[PDB]
């Protein structure tokens, strides 16, 4: 009877992937 | 079928093959249709309540024609109430055997 409330958060997860055939030099 | 697993390509997202249902979770926990035994009329001390259940459940089942002659509907839902463990479970267990 007439009572407020606060809240909360449930953050999702995250993930990434690639073909992984890229070289990272290009320097020299 | 709806709610059915499928095999899916990672590139074109095409279906390959219907995967089988693992179990049917309702029909894996399908509720038991176990044997309706009574412990009999020897739940004495409750006999007034026993006479009520006979006249609201057994009397529609045993005597449909008293309702068919007089023209009144047969009941289908009975509510029981009291403190817990006073035979809410075990009495309707018995009546399903008496019929």
């Amino acid at each position: 009877x007439x009572x407020x409330x606060x809240x909360x958060x449930x953050x999702x997860x995250x993930x990434x992937x690639x073909x992984x055939x890229x070289x990272x030099k290009x320097x020299x | 079928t709806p709610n059915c697993r499928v095999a899916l390509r990672n590139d074109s997202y095409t279906l390959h093959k219907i995967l089988p249902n693992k179990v049917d979770p309702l029909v894996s926990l399908m509720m038991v249709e176990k044997v309706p035994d009574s412990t009999y009329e020897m739940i004495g001390g409750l006999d007034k309540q026993i006479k009520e259940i006979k006249e609201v459940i057994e009397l529609p089942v045993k005597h449909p024609e008293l309702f068919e002659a007089l023209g009144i509907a047969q009941p289908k839902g009975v509510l029981l109430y009291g403190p817990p463990g006073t035979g809410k479970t075990l009495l309707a267990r018995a009546v399903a055997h008496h019929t």
């Binding site: 009877x1 007439x2 009572x3 407020x4 999702x12 | 095409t14 007089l70 023209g71």
Partner: protein, 395 residues
Amino acid sequence: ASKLPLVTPHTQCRLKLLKLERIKDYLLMEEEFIRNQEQMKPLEEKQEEERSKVDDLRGTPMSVGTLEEIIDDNHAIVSTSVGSEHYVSILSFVDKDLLEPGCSVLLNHKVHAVIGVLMDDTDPLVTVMKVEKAPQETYADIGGLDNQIQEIKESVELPLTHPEYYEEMGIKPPKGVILYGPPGTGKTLLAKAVANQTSATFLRVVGSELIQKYLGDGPKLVRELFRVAEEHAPSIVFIDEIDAIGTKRYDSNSGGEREIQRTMLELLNQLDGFDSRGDVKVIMATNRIETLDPALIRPGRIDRKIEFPLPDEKTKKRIFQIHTSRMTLADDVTLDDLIMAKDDLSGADIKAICTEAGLMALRERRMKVTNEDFKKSKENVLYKKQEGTPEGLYL
């Protein structure tokens, strides 16, 4: 589809006879022109050629997004399944007319452009509150009102079924109707009887279920109720039992009763403040009438107030008949033993008698009907009233 918007003679004037036969001519000739397309060049130009141009234009995997906002004509903002938002342009393949915010879409991979729309489901709130079908008995159930029937018919039914008389004089129908009287009279019956024989949608609301233990949800349920009722259809909103939820500002207290005041204050504005709601029929039912807030009672909100009295010996002879119309009747009974005697008892008491006689007979496992069934049932319904009565002798 929206072929010609003119209706303005609205009678048997010769103008409508000329206009609609022009519309008959422009439609026959458009048909007879296009009938001579599949006669002389009967080509199938766009069976798959329209489709295979576009199914190859869109990607084969489709992805469902969500609308957030709409900007000028082609580019709008969307939301992916994770929250990444894209400012992509829509194509002229999707119905732009049913494209409102809060809807699922179909997207692309590279440019993520909006390709199509997925149709919506049915909201649960209609399935909660709407009496979906014609529920119960028609006007063969009611016992001889014939004036209260006449008022509700020309306030709701005859406006809805045959609107032609109001628009002759340009006079709008009255808006609100209060049903009131002693309890057990047939207030719920008359709502369901009009809900039986109707052509528009009907909404039943129990007023006692409008008090949440949270707060703000009082006005929240109200502002969504007329929102659904407006957006759905021609609608008739019935709210039973407003007497013990919206009475008055009796002490101007706080702690819950102030919240109940705020719910009725929203309902008062949501009933009628701004931009007259249109094709919304409001019917309200009470037991008590005196302790009601007069800001609801004033015209502009409710215009019809109908008393529900109790007949004494005349309509009861059918109410006793209708409740005994589907049952047996041995020849030892006369309904005039009870109709002629007492003159105040409700129609709900009559149903309480006509069921109890069926209870007393089959409990003792007997045959059809005795007089002593109706004797003991009438005696019982007295105690069904009297055992909750504190009355002594002349107060």
